[PDB]
């Protein structure tokens, strides 16, 4: 069709992209995604969050947490994120996405530069002390099998664009500011 | 997150929705989708087309044309369309989507009013005379098994919002005008 990605970007005055937020359960991915969305919205930029929990109740309602289903979960989210980026949207994906090979495949779906991998670099011990949903304790007690960071591996990014949360008391707002500053400098916040 | 669908709609000055375009192969779904997108873009509205062929090369690259895979194809497209609508986008889905039960399930995913079913009411004989890709002839010759309208059923909508193409020489532009007029009157082209 005659309407191109650059036409949609011209309309929105921004560049479509994927902000891929990965990290252990409890590392603060969703909290960061919200803070970022709020901040970008106030600057007049259009974002949309694909959160692992949300998507697992709709598009991915058929997927379990077996390793193969985690890969399919990530794969589908990567493809949908690509569609949002093509629509000119700043798409924020917030999924544990534990496997390096699967996150890398999502990156390869996109043109160089359009995929910003954001690592919530928060150690297991801190996530487990947070344990907002009580999942780690259920996992430790064997009620949840194959839980990421306990009985299934989490593979951190080797070369991500942004690493967050390493240090203490860095607030979700300050972290979103760092992401927004990065996007602004890279030119994603204007056509 | 604090940013709501109504906030995104306020930013874009339009209402998110799904325009579900269904019909036989060759009925002119993609041609209509493009014309519509072009017309809405010129009015400053943001649309995005989910075309069956396109999506089958990415998100749905794992699906065949067996009946169960057509249902899954439609199901996933409905879920993605819902996400686009929630982002405030006018999402145009252009898929054969032959099964009534599966299109109806996509409709039920959305709030009343947010799903506009558009039937390309073009008889098999006309689609087959067009046969732009030579698919009908391959189907007739047994090279393609289970082809919609030949060896697999197409179930027309019983109560769609818009029916197009019934009559001769109605142009894609005139048809898009009818859809745009409908969207405009229903209030989808303003926040
Ligand atoms: N920057 C932060 N500093 C301190 N606490 C935080 C921070 N961000 C999030 N939290 C808290 O840590 C808990 C988990 O955050 P959350 O954003 O839900 O994690 P997640 O990575 O989205 N979890 P999951 O959905 O299971 O993968 C929440 O209760 C937050 O309040
Ligand atoms: N309104 C129209 N009037 C006359 N011819 C048309 C019209 N719309 C489309 N066509 C032609 O019919 C052919 C098929 O149109 P197309 O939009 O590709 O069909 P479709 O429903 O998208 N096919 P498919 O992708 O296999 O499901 C094209 O070559 C068009 O040129
Ligand atoms: N075995 C598990 N491992 C990790 N998260 C789980 C598990 N079981 C349920 N969950 C829940 O599902 C959410 C994670 O889903 P995803 O982000 O979609 O995971 S992913 O690995 O497939 O990317 C977590 O919030 C967690 O609450
Ligand atoms: N057996 C088939 N029936 C219909 N379309 C087919 C078939 N095999 C290949 N195709 C192609 O795939 C396209 C249709 O895909 P979809 O729109 O995604 O179909 S759907 O039934 O699953 O909704 C058509 O353009 C057609 O070219
Ligand atoms: Mg979360
Ligand atoms: Mg088509």
From Swiss-Prot, chains A, B:
What keywords were assigned to this record? Amino-acid biosynthesis, ATP-binding, Chloroplast, Cysteine biosynthesis, Disulfide bond, Kinase, Nucleotide-binding, Plastid, Transferase, Transit peptide
**What's its catalytic activity?**
adenosine 5'-phosphosulfate + ATP = 3'-phosphoadenylyl sulfate + ADP + H(+)
Enzyme class comes to transferase
Q: Where does substrate bind?
A: 53, 56, 70, 73, 96-97, 146
Q: Where is this site: Participates in a stacking interaction with the adenine ring of adenylyl-sulfate?
A: 65
Disruption of the gene: reported phenotype = No visible phenotype under normal growth conditions. Apk1 and apk2 double mutant exhibits a semi-dwarf phenotype.
Pathway in which this enzyme or protein is active = Sulfur metabolism; hydrogen sulfide biosynthesis; sulfite from sulfate: step 2/3
Primary location recorded for the protein, binned into one broad class: plastid
Question: Active site annotated at which positions?
Answer: 97 (phosphoserine intermediate)
Which tissue types show expression of this protein?
Answer: Expressed in root vasculature, root tips, leaf epidermal and guard cells, pollen grains and funiculus of developing seeds.
- The UniProt annotation places ATP binding at 23-31
Q: What is its EC number?
A: 2.7.1.25
The alphabetized list of GO BP terms reads: cysteine biosynthetic process; hydrogen sulfide biosynthetic process; phosphorylation; sulfate assimilation
Cellular component (GO) terms are: chloroplast; plastid
- Assembly information from the UniProt record: Homodimer; disulfide-linked. Interacts with APK2.
Q: What is this protein called?
A: Adenylyl-sulfate kinase 1, chloroplastic
The organism is Arabidopsis thaliana (Mouse-ear cress)
């Amino acid at each position: 069709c005659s309407v191109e990605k650059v036409d949609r970007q011209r309309l929105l005055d921004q560049k479509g992209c994927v902000i891929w937020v990965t990290g252990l359960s409890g590392s603060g991915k969703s909290t960061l995604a919200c803070a970022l969305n709020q901040m970008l919205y106030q600057k007049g930029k259009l974002c949309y969050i694909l959160d692992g929990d949300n998507v697992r109740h709709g598009l991915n309602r058929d997927l379990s947490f077996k390793a193969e289903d985690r890969a399919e979960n990530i794969r589908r989210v990567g493809e949908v994120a690509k569609l949002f980026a093509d629509a000119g949207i700043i798409c924020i994906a917030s999924l544990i996405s534990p496997y390096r090979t699967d996150r890398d495949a999502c990156r390869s779906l996109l043109p160089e530069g359009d995929f910003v991998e954001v690592f919530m670099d928060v150690p297991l011990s801190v996530c487990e002390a947070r344990d907002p949903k009580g999942l780690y304790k259920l996992a430790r007690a064997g009620k949840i099998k194959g839980f990421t960071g306990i009985d299934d591996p989490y593979e951190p990014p080797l070369n991500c664009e942004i690493s967050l949360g390493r240090e203490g008391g860095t607030s979700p707002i300050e972290m979103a500011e760092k992401v927004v500053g990065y996007l602004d400098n890279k030119g994603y916040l204007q056509a």
